[PDB]
Amino acid sequence: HGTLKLAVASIIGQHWLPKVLKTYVERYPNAKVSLITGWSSEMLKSLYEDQVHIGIIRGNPEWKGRKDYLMTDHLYLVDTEISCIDDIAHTDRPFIQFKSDSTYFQEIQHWWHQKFKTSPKQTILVDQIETCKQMALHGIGYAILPSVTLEEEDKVNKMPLLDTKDHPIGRDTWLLGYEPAFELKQVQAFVSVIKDMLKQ
Amino acid sequence: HGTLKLAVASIIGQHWLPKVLKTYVERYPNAKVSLITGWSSEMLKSLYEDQVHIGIIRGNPEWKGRKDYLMTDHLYLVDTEISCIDDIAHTDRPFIQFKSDSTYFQEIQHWWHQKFKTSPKQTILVDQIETCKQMALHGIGYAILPSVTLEEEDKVNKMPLLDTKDHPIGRDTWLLGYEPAFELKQVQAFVSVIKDMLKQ
């Protein structure tokens, strides 16, 4: 029962993985866990280069190994004052806007263009989603966040992002590895903890 | 006015920078900000390669431009169960350790060797500090965090780390940047806002 090496997308590492690691540690005391985090592209690279056993990756990664769908969450435009999502096309509050090399940024641009037929205000550009949340909780402006980072208790208005046909805009999260990893007892225990937690 | 390109150490970007940025947007509407985060070394290296105007770096960075001391925070051990820091030399409760290329990790090994005359049991190694905090908040184990990441709303016991000679153990945060950037106007209004902030 050796060391489990994980490469996990940042918002997952922050918001979803802790509860999984709690159960993993509860069932397997003193099992060693090594965790790196970051952009999805970076964690995929790490997994591709044999540096970890398992990647948890968002988006739609192409992968010639084992790939398990985990979950989907949906985008919300959050703000402290604005209550109605149509006002966002006129307000003077800045668009705090996450941007990495994933498709998250492009897809919000596409939604904005289609819904409002205008372009959004490239004022504040941030390279990590959690800083967007924080900056938005502090009233600086509004933000578009995946619901995996939101809680009901968050003092901020929650406005569903819907496409032109009123369908919530989603993002997927996958678990990825090559066959040798899945033969390891600690990888298998971790996967088993995950596929337990998904039914909750 | 011009667009301010910041590089901030991750924990600063999340915990300290949002209030600094709120005031800066409050006094300067339509002023654009662009923010990359990460390890101090990575933001130092980016500042050196002219990608940003201003770096907010942690530790003791060597720098041959302008270096403004900013603040000092102190290391706290946190756990949901453990209330006395001497308990940890004897607990099967796991140790959640942040580790990067900065001195942070070896600083803590040194304090531990010098206080408990033993080595800490490495079970959980993670590569970003906020992930340590969350995993500590989730009761998984104890962590050692800088106070800038802590709040009283954080439902964990917080225990100050003191060296062999009764003294709290600190890390500093600086503000670096080459002379030209400080000529630029938005940099001056941001350096300003910071220093007028710090006056409580």
Residue numbers in the entry:
A (entry chain A), B (entry chain C): 90 to 289
Q: Would you copy out the relevant sentences from the publication that reported this structure?
A:
Catabolite control protein C (CcpC) belongs to the LysR-type transcriptional regulator (LTTR) family, which regulates the transcription of genes encoding the tricarboxylic acid branch enzymes of the TCA cycle by responding to a pathway-specific metabolite, citrate. CcpC widely exists in prokaryotes and is classified as belonging to the LysR-type transcriptional regulator (LTTR) family. Two CcpC dimers interact with these sites for repression, resulting in bending of the DNA, and then blocking the access of RNA polymerase to the promoter, which results in repression of citB expression. IBD serves as a binding site of inducer and thus plays an important role in transcriptional activation by binding to inducers.
Finally, we obtained crystals for the IBD of BaCcpC and determined the crystal structure of BaCcpC-IBD in complex with citrate at 2.3 Å resolution using single-wavelength anomalous diffraction (SAD) phasing. The BaCcpC-IBD molecule is composed of two distinct regulatory domains: IBD-I (His90-Arg155 and Gly266-Gln289) and IBD-II (Asp168-Gly259). IBD-II has four β-sheets, which are surrounded by two α-helices and two 310 helices. Both the IBD-I and IBD-II subdomains adopt the typical α/β fold, which is connected by two crossover regions that form a hinge at central regions of two antiparallel β-strands (β4 and β9). Five BaCcpC-IBD molecules are in the asymmetric unit, and each molecule has an RMSD of 0.201–0.275 Å for the 144–180 Cα atoms, which emphasizes the similarity of their conformations. BaCcpC-IBD forms dimers with a head-to-tail arrangement in the asymmetric unit of its crystal structure, and both molecules have essentially the same overall structure. Superposition of two dimeric molecules in the asymmetric unit gives an RMSD of 0.327 Å for 321 Cα. The dimeric interface is stabilized by the main chain interactions Val122-Thr212* (2.82 Å, * denoting the partner molecule), Val122-Leu214* (2.92 Å), Leu124-Asp216* (2.80 Å), and Thr126-Asp216* (3.33 Å) between the β2 strand and β6 strand. The electron density corresponding to citrate molecules is found at the positively charged interface between IBD-I and IBD-II of BaCcpC-IBD. To distinguish between the terminal carboxyl groups, these were named pro-R and pro-S. The pro-R carboxyl group accepts a strong hydrogen bond from the backbone nitrogen atom of Ile100 (average distance for five molecules in the asymmetric unit: 3.12 Å). In addition, the pro-S carboxyl group also has hydrogen bonds from the side-chain NE atoms of Arg147 (2.93 Å) and Arg260 (2.80 Å). The central carboxyl group of citrate accepts hydrogen bonds from the backbone nitrogen atom of Ser129 (2.70 Å), the side-chain hydroxyl group, and Ser189 (2.59 Å) and Ser191 (2.89 Å).
